[PDB]
Design a protein around this ligand. Structure first.
Ligand SMILES: *[C@@H]1O[C@H](CO)[C@@H](O[C@@H]2O[C@H](CO)[C@@H](O)[C@H](O)[C@H]2NC(C)=O)[C@H](O)[C@H]1NC(C)=O
Length: 305
């Protein structure tokens, strides 16, 4: 069958042009292309993470109502993914901020998630991702925000879906034990928490260059996090990762994923960053037919499918 339970791609677009809230569809932002998603489904991928902006989903206050247009464009892509039998990760790509302000209301954040999860409650293939890449916030608040998210999700009766929780410091795997050990104190009625981390292999780990530090940096940056999951009896998914289209980066990726496949009892899978229809020139574009990463990594990544 497989090495991992899941392996797939992020599908970007709905989170673009975040300077313009609400912005205009087709100008500031778009929704992912279902035809292009099917090409990746055809290839063997079975999980897709679809970013969006909290402010476009629920404008003005996070206790408010849905924007019907933006939600229905987003819903359309989520339900295509689950319609084909693959898991769809619902990802408010917000860095723990709302209208630019670090989120500090656990009740307004729990109300946000109740409203959102209530529209997916009976879709067993939806995955909930509490927020993309918390950073530069207090660890206590971050953990409470992940707990508030779990609480609103279940309250609304979405109890069969996995919840992806993310840590501080951009939820990096290589820094996980430095900053996010507190995240062990998270609880779920359904007991379906997966710890989602991100790892890039360039100098800063910021994922902004196509050069990797070395052919072994990828394995190096996931060891500690692998031990932490095994130690505390938790589960993980690498929700984002990428490398440049050169052999040093490719070898780093392979040895990173080798090490995670060797530890698949804690690692449930991985998700490449990123596919989507507006990436063009992007160094990590997984979008068919021409994206650089589609051209250089798809063959590589299928060996782990
Ligand atoms: C959505 O994806 C499909 C397939 O990747 C794109 O369709 C291709 O479009 C090119 C350029 O317009 C055509 O020449 C190909 O014949 C199409 N291929 C297939 C398999 O249909 C489609 O354009 C994408 N939508 C976008 C980018 O907005």
């Amino acid at each position: 069958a497989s090495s991992f339970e899941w392996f797939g791609s992020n599908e970007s677009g709905a989170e673009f042009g975040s300077g313009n809230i609400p912005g205009v569809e087709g100008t500031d932002y778009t929704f992912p292309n279902t035809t292009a998603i099917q090409i990746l489904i055809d290839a063997g991928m079975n999980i897709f993470r679809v970013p969006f902006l909290m402010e476009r989903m629920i404008p003005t206050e996070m206790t408010g109502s849905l924007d019907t247009a933006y939600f229905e464009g987003y819903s359309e892509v989520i339900n295509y993914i689950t319609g084909k039998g693959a898991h769809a990760v619902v990802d408010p790509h917000n860095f723990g901020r709302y209208y630019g302000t670090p989120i500090s209301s656990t009740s307004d954040f729990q109300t946000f998630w109740s409203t959102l999860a209530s529209q997916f409650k009976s879709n067993d293939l939806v995955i909930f991702d509490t927020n993309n890449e918390y950073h530069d916030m207090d660890e206590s608040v971050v953990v409470a925000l992940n707990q508030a998210a779990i609480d609103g999700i279940r309250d609304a009766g979405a109890t069969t879906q996995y919840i992806f929780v993310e840590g501080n410091a951009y939820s990096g795997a290589w820094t996980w034990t430095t900053y996010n050990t507190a995240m062990v104190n998270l609880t779920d009625p359904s007991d379906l928490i997966v710890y989602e981390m991100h790892q890039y292999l360039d100098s800063a780990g910021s994922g902004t260059s196509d050069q990797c530090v070395s052919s072994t940096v990828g394995q190096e940056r996931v060891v500690d996090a692998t031990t932490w999951l095994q130690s505390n009896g938790k589960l993980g998914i690498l929700g984002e990762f990428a490398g440049g289209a050169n052999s040093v980066c490719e070898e780093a990726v392979e040895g990173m994923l080798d090490y995670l496949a060797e530890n698949s009892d804690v690692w449930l899978g991985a998700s490449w960053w990123s596919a989507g229809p507006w990436w063009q020139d992007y160094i990590y574009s997984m979008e068919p037919p021409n994206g650089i990463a589609y051209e250089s990594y798809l063959s590589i990544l299928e060996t782990y499918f």
